C-alpha cells in the first residue's frame with residue numbers, strides 16, 4: 001500500500017551527465033554515443049543573450065573553446081554544430097555507459113523524471129508533468145541548464161526534456177532533445193511569460209482511481225454523468241476537456257475498481273462544485289494532476305527497470 | 307526557483323540491488339563489497355509467521371540454500387550470519403559497483419530517499435521521512451522487502467533504512483542496516499499497531515522558511531511567541547514538541563530570511579488557527595512536514611527573493 005510521487009531510477013542517465021564550459025559559462029551536457037548535447041545559449045555572453053544570432057556567435061568558436069569534463073576526465077571535442085536550440089558537440093570517445101535510448105517529444109499532460117544537475121554532477125531527481133501551458137513546475141537553480149528529463153519504457157531511456165530557462169513566475173521552460181521548445185518560448189533575454197494554466201483532467205481521474213485502490217473512498221457517490229455534461233463543468237473550472245480517448249485509456253482502472261469513468265466524473269464534478277469539506281485524498285487537500293493513468297497502473301503493480 | 311520533494315539520484319544504490327531467494331520466498335538484498343544484506347524473515351515459512359525462532363531456523367540452513375542473483379548472474383554464497391533482524395550473506399565476489407558508503411541510524415524527522423525494488427531490480431525512487439511514531443509512509447508492494455533508504459552526502463551513500471513489513475494502517479516499518487528496528491516493532495506477524503502519529507514541527511517551520519526564500523510572505527504576522535506558549539498551542543494540534551535544539555537548528559534559515567525563529571512560530575500558530583483560506587504555500591493546501599532544515603538549505607537558493 002501507499003502512493004507516492006515516484007521518479008524512475010536515475011542510474012542510466014547519471015552515467016551520461018557531463019560538464020560543459022564555454023568561456024565564463026558552465027552548464028550541463030548529455031553525453032550519448034560520441035555527441036554531447038547541451039543548450040545552444042551556452043555560447044552567449046550576457047549582452048549576446050539580449051538579441052543573439054547563434055550561427056554568427058558559433059562560427060567564431062573553435063572545438064577547443066568547448067571544455068567538456070566527464071567526471072574528472074576531460075573529453076576532446078572534435079566537431080560542433082547546432083540543431084534548433086541545442087548544440088551538438090562531437091567528441092573523440094563514445095560514452096561507454098551509453099544506455100539504450102531514444103529522443104521522444106512528449107504531449108502536455110504526460111509526466112517525466114528530471115535529473116537536476118550542476119557542474120555535470122547529478123544532485124536530485126523528481127517527477128514533473130508537462131503542463132497544458134507547456135511549462136514545467138520544476139526546481140532549478142543557476143547552473144542547472146542542460147539537466148534532462150526522461151522516462152524509461154521497458155529498458156530504453158526515452159529522453160524528452162532539456163532545461164533552458166526560468167520564467168518570471170518561477171516555472172520552467174525547455175526543449176526536447178532535438179532542440180524544439182515546448183511552448184511559445186525563445187532562448188533570448190526578452191519579455192516572456194507563462195500563459196494561464198489549466199488542470200489535467202484525465203490525470204486527476206487517474207489519481208482518484210489511485211485513491212480508491214488505496215482505500216480512500218469517501219468521494220464516491222451514486223451518480224454518473226455524460227461527457228458533454230461533465231466537459232461543461234470542466235470548462236467552467238479551468239479543467240482540460242475529457243475526450244473519448246481519455247475514457248478509453250482509463251478503461252482498465254474503471255473495470256478494476258468497478259467505477260466507470262463517467263461515474264468517477266460525477267465524483268469529480270461534485271468535488272469541483274462543493275470542495276472537499278475538510279477531508280483529504282491520498283493525504284492531499286488539492287486535486288492532484290501530475291500522475292498519468294500509466295503512472296497509477298505501474299506504481300500499483302510494481303513494474304521494474306533493471 | 308521552485309520547490310519539489312526531491313530524491314537523491316539512485317544510481318549508486320541501483321548498482322547494489324540483488325535478488326535473494328530462500329525456499330519459495332524471494333526478496334531484495336543489498337550487495338556491498340562481498341556481503342549481501344537482507345531481512346532475516348526471508349528464511350521463514352508459512353507456519354513461522356507468528357513466533358519464529360530465527361536462531362533455530364537459520365542453523366538448519368547451508369550456504370547453498372540461499373540463491374543470490376545479481377543481474378543475470380548467480381553469486382555464490384560462502385557464508386552466512388545474522389545480526390539482529392538482518393541476514394548477512396558472504397558471497398564469493400566483491401561488488402565492483404560498491405560506492406563509498408556507511409550505515410547511519412536516523413532519528414524521527416529525518417528524511418531519506420527510498421529505492422523501491424522487486425526481484426532485485428529498481429522500480430522507482432521517492433522521498434520519505436521517519437515519522438515520530440517510527441513508521442514511514444512509503445509505497446511498497448508484496449516483494450518490496452529488502453528495498454533500502456539512503457542519503458548521499460558528497461559521494462558517500464549513507465544507508466539508513468531497510469524495509470521489512472507493512473502495518474495494518476498501510477504504513478511501513480523496517481530496520482537500520484545493523485538490523486535494529488525503528489520503533490517498537492518486531493519481525494513477527496503478531497498484532498502490532500503504530501502509535502498515533504504527529505506532525506514534525508521543526509520540518510514545517512523549515513518549509514515555511516523555504517516559502518519565504520522563494521518569495522511568499524502572506525502567512526507572516528506581526529506577533530511573536532515564547533517557546534513554551536508555542537508548544538502549549540501546537541500540541542493541541544497533534545504537533546511534536548519544538549525543542550531548543552530545533553530552534554538552534556533553524557538559526558541559518560532565520561538569518562537568511564530575517565525572520566526570528568519564534569516569529570515564524572507565531573506564524574505557524576496562526577496558520578493552525580486560521581487554515582489557509584483558499585491560499586496555498588509552495589503549491590500545497592496543507593502544511594508540509596517531510597522537508598528538514600538541511601533539505602531546505604540544500605534545495606533553496608542562498609539568496610532570498612525579497
Ligand SMILES: FC(F)(F)c1cc(-c2ccncc2)[nH]n1
Nearest residue numbers: 001446447448449450451471472
Ligand atoms: F503477502 C502479501 F499479503 F501478499 C503481501 C505482502 C505485502 C507487502 C506490502 C508492503 N511491504 C511488504 C509486503 N503486500 N502483499
Ligand SMILES: [Cl-]
Nearest residue numbers: 222223224225
Ligand atoms: Cl445519475
Ligand code: NA
Nearest residue numbers: 221223263266
Ligand atoms: Na458516482
Ligand code: NA
Nearest residue numbers: 323324426427
Ligand atoms: Na539488480
